[PDB]
A paper describes a structure:
Vesicular stomatitis virus (VSV) is a negative-strand RNA virus with a non-segmented genome, closely related to rabies virus. The VSV RNP complex assembles, together with M, into a helical, bullet-shaped structure, as it buds through the plasma membrane of an infected cell. The asymmetric unit of the VSV helical nucleocapsid, which repeats every 9 RNA nucleotides, contains one nucleoprotein (N) subunit and two (chemically identical) matrix protein subunits (M1 and M2). N is an elongated, two-lobed protein of ~420 amino-acid residues; the single stranded RNA binds in a cleft between the two lobes, with nine nucleotides per N subunit.
We obtained a helical reconstruction of the trunk at 4.1 Å resolution, and a local reconstruction of the basic building module (one N and two M proteins) at 3.5 Å resolution. We also calculated a local reconstruction by alignment and averaging of the asymmetric units (N subunit, 9 bound RNA nucleotides, and the two matrix protein subunits M1 and M2) from all N classes, yielding a nominal resolution of 3.5 Å. This map was then used to build and refine a molecular model of the asymmetric unit. We modeled the RNA nucleotides as poly-uridine, because the density in our reconstruction is the average of different sequences. Conserved residues NArg143, NLys206, NArg214, NLys286, NArg408, all ordered in our reconstruction with well-resolved side chain density, coordinate the phosphate groups of the RNA backbone by salt bridges. Conserved NTyr152 hydrogen-bonds to the phosphate group of nucleotide 8, and stacks with its aromatic side chain onto the sugar ring of nucleotide 6. Each N protein contacts three M1 subunits. The first of these radial inter-layer contacts, interface i, is the most extended, and the one that is also present in the tip of the VSV bullet (see below). The contact is well resolved in our local reconstruction and involves N protein residues 116–125 from a long loop that wraps around the N lobe domain and binds two M1 subunit loops, residues 94–101 and 149–152. Stabilizing interactions include hydrogen bonds between the main chain of the N loop 116–125 with the M1 loop 94–101. We also observe hydrophobic contacts between residues NVal121 and M1Met98 and NVal116-NLeu117-NPro118 and M1Pro149-M1Pro150.
Numbering used by the authors:
A (entry chain B): 57 to 227
B (entry chain D): 2 to 35
C (entry chain A): 20 to 341, 366 to 422
D (entry chain E): 335 to 373
E (entry chain F): 43 to 59
F (entry chain C): 58 to 229
Write the structure that this text describes.
RNA sequence: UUUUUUUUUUUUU
């Protein structure tokens, strides 16, 4: 195996609905990590989808309704751009600019509610100079990149001279 | 079998059949080979 | 030549002796199960996955063997062993990038018993462009699946149509033909029901033989007496074009009927588009001899009809009857005499017979031999 | 061209061994201008 | 501040005359 | 592999915001993220960060600040020749072309924009040059590593005697 | 007039 680079457009939208509003970030990872308990999406995009769900969970904004009324909070996120990722999973077949929607209930101890995601990834054949996917993290929140990468079922590496390259999907 | 020659040329041909149905097979073969 | 040339099956094994078949086997059986089963539910499955799935399902099926299979200088096993379904064609490795799919991780094995049957039935049903027939077949298929794994539900919903392009593929039809041949030899197999989907492939593009056989059976005469009664140098070219030493016919266990599917022949000489005069004369005789399968044939054009009808009617009267009156017995040698000596005009009795043979016909379709007969003889 | 639609070409095409019918047409009395046959 | 994600900044500035 | 890499460097740093800065820590936090979405040369990412460190040490005021306290503004500029000990292995070839970045910085109390114009390129000359690390005048104290980490650069305070760059995990 | 085809025939006796 060897490092392979993959450039692609990405578009993301995530929503989480629950009560007893959503304290601390650890529960963010734990809850949203169960967006694919019974996956029926297009295989071959699982690494991309897991990375993308992690990205969206990182920088989700709670809605003003959370501030004003506590009865039903809501958390939203939305992203779009072009990024290039290094990975070693294998070789990816042709992609497509098709949307994918997922919607699931979750229940982690004290928290219970619903998750609804909508994503779209598609390969780019251009000659632009796109940024790395990792840089799309704000870095103003959360701590450590191995543990959180594991919370989603995603094993990465910490190359000294470069940036993070995937290893595999634990699942 | 019988021969039927093209009148104009006198060449030889032999009309076979489509054989779109099945053949037959008597019991003997089954008790004669295995 | 704005038309196309003709090719023969024997002229294919005189070069190469292995029928190639290209597939992919990189992905496991469970992944292909997911891909096919879900792709059909959404309705965006790719062909390559269906090919590889049928390969990975019809691979543990086998049977015994009684006798001496061989064909066009080829051999298949030997009495007293076991064989598969893909031991009839040569496998190789397909190359090039492959598409993706929609995978599932819960697919019980029991949903393979009826899936290859489903896909073969789809191949069959996607061949006739008529809503009534199409829905009759797409309900018979569901009933067939029900009798096996009832609580099966229809896939590929009734809207945007799929599986009608697959006829353009070359490996899929090879798979279907091999399946049909194997389950046609072994009819007592418990999984023979797969042949519900693969029966259209056997005599395909060969509707010039079938007519010859039907005429041989209806008439009741031998084949020599039948080929004697031609009386035109328009079907004789076609008759000579259908009867050559090689291209072994009358051997049920041969590769001829799949000359189209397996690729042994591009344009079969036995078509109804390259033997239109023969087709028309044969099935007009059949129509004038109180046959059922004569009023649904097609009426090919660019053929001069004024000649064939008289010969067909003469032959029908000859078989159906047997001046001093018509001669007794049936032989052309003493029939052309009576026709010639009384000039070319058909007897009124002959036309009465022709009309009474087609007096009553309930259903008729445009460009049918029934239509022509009811138009010219009903006068 | 009018002939092709009147006088179809009927004759023996395939013969069983040495039994080809021969045209017995030598009598010149037809005898008017009625349509002749052939093509 | 007791929670996470309960807006950030609201960059648009109302802290002005 | 203790690799000594030489380069000429030029750096021009500018900061705009309201709520003029008081403590250097806030400025350092603001500047540390100057590369939110990097689309520059892949191989040049770490060294620029080191050079950003230099820019941080050299924050300057202008008479604009002296003219009004409601339009904070800082300038800074440095340039010269240097060489860096590093344990990243081997660096690709580098070219001499200017590069520029302008990003918005948001740490809450402080909000504004940060602009960095950098130009780092090879020195094919064969002469010796002093250490890049012993080039500033802000030697501060023994917590130099803490500042470097706060930017996101891991350095050494071991018996080596210098502050060699170590690693990534610059994200935290 | 993509491509072939030409019983809105066919699991099998």
């Amino acid at each position: 195996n060897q490092l392979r680079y993959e450039k692609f457009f990405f578009t993301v939208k995530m929503t989480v609905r629950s009560n007893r509003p959503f304290r601390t970030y650890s529960d963010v990872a734990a809850a949203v990590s169960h967006w694919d308990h019974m996956y029926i999406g297009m295989a071959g995009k699982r690494p991309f989808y897991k990375i993308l769900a992690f990205l969206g969970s990182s920088n989700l904004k709670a809605t003003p309704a959370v501030l004003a009324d506590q009865g039903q909070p809501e958390y939203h996120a939305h992203c779009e751009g072009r990024a290039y990722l290094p990975h070693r999973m294998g070789k990816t077949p042709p992609m497509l600019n098709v949307p994918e929607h997922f919607r699931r209930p979750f229940n982690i101890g004290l928290y219970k509610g619903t998750i609804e995601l909508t994503m779209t990834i598609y390969d780019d054949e251009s000659l632009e100079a796109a940024p790395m996917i990792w840089d799309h993290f704000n870095s103003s929140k959360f701590s450590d990149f191995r543990e959180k990468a594991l919370m989603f079922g995603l094993i990465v590496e910490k190359k000294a001279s470069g940036a993070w390259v995937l290893d595999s999907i634990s699942h | 079998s019988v021969t039927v020659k093209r009148i104009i040329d006198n060449t030889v041909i032999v009309p076979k059949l489509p054989a779109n149905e099945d053949p037959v097979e008597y019991p003997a073969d089954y008790f004669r080979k295995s | 030549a704005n038309e196309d040339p003709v090719e023969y099956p024997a002229d294919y094994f005189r070069k190469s002796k292995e029928i190639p078949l290209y597939i992919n086997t990189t992905k496991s059986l469970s992944d292909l199960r997911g891909y096919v089963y879900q792709g059909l539910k959404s309705g965006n499955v790719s062909i390559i996955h269906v090919n590889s799935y049928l390969y990975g399902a019809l691979k543990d099926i086998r049977g015994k063997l009684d006798k001496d299979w061989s064909s066009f200088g080829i051999n298949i096993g030997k009495a007293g062993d076991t064989i598969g379904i893909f031991d009839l064609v040569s496998l190789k490795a397909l190359d090039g990038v492959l598409p993706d799919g929609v995978s599932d991780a819960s697919r019980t094995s029991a949903d393979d018993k009826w899936l290859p049957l489903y896909l073969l039935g789809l191949y069959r049903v996607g061949r006739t462009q008529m809503p009534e027939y199409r829905k009759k077949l797409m309900d018979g298929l569901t009933n067939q699946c029900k009798m096996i794994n009832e609580q099966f539900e229809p896939l590929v919903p009734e809207g945007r149509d799929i599986f009608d392009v697959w006829g353009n593929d070359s490996n899929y039809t090879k798979i279907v033909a091999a399946v049909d041949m194997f389950f046609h030899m072994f009819k007592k197999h418990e999984c023979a029901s797969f042949r519900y989907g693969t029966i259209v492939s056997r005599f395909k593009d060969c509707a010039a033989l079938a007519t010859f056989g039907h005429l041989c059976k209806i008439t009741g005469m031998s084949t020599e007496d039948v080929t004697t009664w031609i009386l035109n140098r328009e079907v004789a070219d076609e008759m000579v074009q259908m009867m050559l030493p090689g291209q072994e016919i009358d051997k049920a266990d041969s590769y001829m009927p799949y000359l189209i599917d397996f690729g042994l022949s591009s344009k079969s000489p036995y078509s109804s588009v390259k033997n239109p005069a023969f087709h028309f004369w044969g099935q007009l005789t059949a129509l004038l001899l109180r046959s059922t399968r004569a009023r649904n044939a097609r009426q090919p054009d660019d053929i001069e009809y004024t000649s064939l009808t008289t010969a067909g009617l003469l032959y029908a009267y000859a078989v159906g009857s047997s001046t001093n009156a018509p001669p007794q017995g049936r032989d052309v040698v003493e029939w052309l005499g009576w026709f010639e000596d009384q000039n070319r005009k058909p007897t009124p009795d002959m036309m009465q017979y022709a009309k009474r043979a087609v007096m009553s016909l309930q259903g008729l379709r445009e460009k049918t031999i029934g239509k022509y007969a009811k138009s010219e003889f009903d006068k | 061209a009018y002939a092709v639609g009147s006088s179809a070409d009927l004759a023996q095409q395939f013969c069983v061994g040495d039994n080809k019918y021969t045209p017995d047409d030598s009598t010149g009395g037809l005898t008017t201008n009625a349509p002749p046959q052939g093509r | 501040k007791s929670y996470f994600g309960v807006d950030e900044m609201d960059t648009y500035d109302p802290n002005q005359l």
